[PDB]
Paper text:
Destabilase from the medical leech Hirudo medicinalis belongs to the family of i-type lysozymes. It has two different enzymatic activities: microbial cell walls destruction (muramidase activity), and dissolution of the stabilized fibrin (isopeptidase activity). The main difference between low and high salt structures as well as between the two chains of high salt structure is tied to a flexible loop (Gly44-Ser51), containing enzymatically important Asp46. Together with Glu34, Asp46 forms a catalytic dyad for muramidase activity in i-type lysozymes.
To get structural insights into destabilase function we solved its structure in two different crystal forms: P1—obtained at pH 5.0 and high sodium salt concentrations (2.9 M sodium malonate) and P21—obtained at pH 8.0 and low sodium concentration (0.3 M sodium chloride). In the high salt structure, both protein chains possess a more compact Gly44-Ser51 loop adherent to the protein core. Asp46 has two alternative conformations in both chains and in all cases is oriented towards Glu34. In our high salt structure, both A and B chains contain one sodium ion with 50% occupancy situated in the cleft between Glu34 and Asp46 and stabilized in octahedral coordination with water molecules by Glu34 and Asp46 side chains. Remarkably, in addition to its high sodium content, the crystallization sample of the high salt destabilase structure also included a muramidase product inhibitor NAG3. However, electron density maps did not reveal the presence of NAG3 molecule, suggesting that the inhibitory effect of sodium ions was at play. Given that the sodium ion appears near Ser51 in our high salt structure, we propose this serine to be the nucleophile in destabilase.
Numbering used by the authors:
A (entry chain A): 21 to 142
B (entry chain B): 21 to 139
Write the structure that this text describes.
């Protein structure tokens, strides 16, 4: 399963509560809210809520989206393998192929640091 | 992407190599070859090869057809969402709207068992 702990650590890496209500530009695209979701991701997760920005600025709608995204793409990305949080986090960062991409490994390392509590600061 | 694993499991569910060179009726109309392709599907994939049966009886020409059909119809069927193998398999069985049909759910269940090794 895609667990709440996995989801929370993805949130922390992306910025989480400090980004509620907020958008910025990333690589030419608007990216909004605690999970830093771009419009293609919101389309891919099934367009929850009332619209792109209104959903993705909001924590609850963003979480609905992320969970739907992981259900839709997890086993797709892995090629039928049971996915783990490593897969889900790498999918979040890199898209539906992200679990296989070298581009998402550093992102996973940040999520894993959160999950495993390493070099933790107050 | 439409992957080779997805293509292979579609092939297996349809009968695959046992159907090379063969046609038969399939829910009311002719289907041919390892992927059980009907003539409207062969038109919709761009009429590859020399003709309907001559292409679709053959594994390689059938695969050209299937690959073109998935590219043509995948994101159309999903309404702009990145397609998965579930979408592609369901499009194969049910046409350009197959990814959102009922009627294609049992077909996916069979393909999924192939992909997960359960089956
Ligand atoms: Na934060
Ligand atoms: Na991102
Ligand atoms: Na069929």
């Amino acid at each position: 399963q895609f667990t709440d702990s996995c989801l929370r650590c993805i949130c922390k890496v992306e910025g989480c509560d400090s980004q509620i209500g907020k958008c910025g530009m990333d690589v030419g695209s608007l990216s909004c809210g605690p999970y830093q979701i771009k419009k293609p991701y919101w389309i891919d997760c099934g367009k929850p809520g009332g619209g792109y920005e209104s959903c993705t600025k909001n924590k609850a709608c963003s979480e609905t989206c992320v969970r739907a995204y992981m259900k839709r793409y997890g086993t797709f990305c892995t090629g039928g393998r049971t996915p783990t949080c490593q897969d889900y986090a790498r999918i979040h960062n890199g898209g539906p192929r992200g679990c296989k991409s070298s581009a998402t490994v550093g992102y996973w390392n940040k999520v894993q640091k959160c999950l495993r509590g390493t070099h933790h600061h107050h």
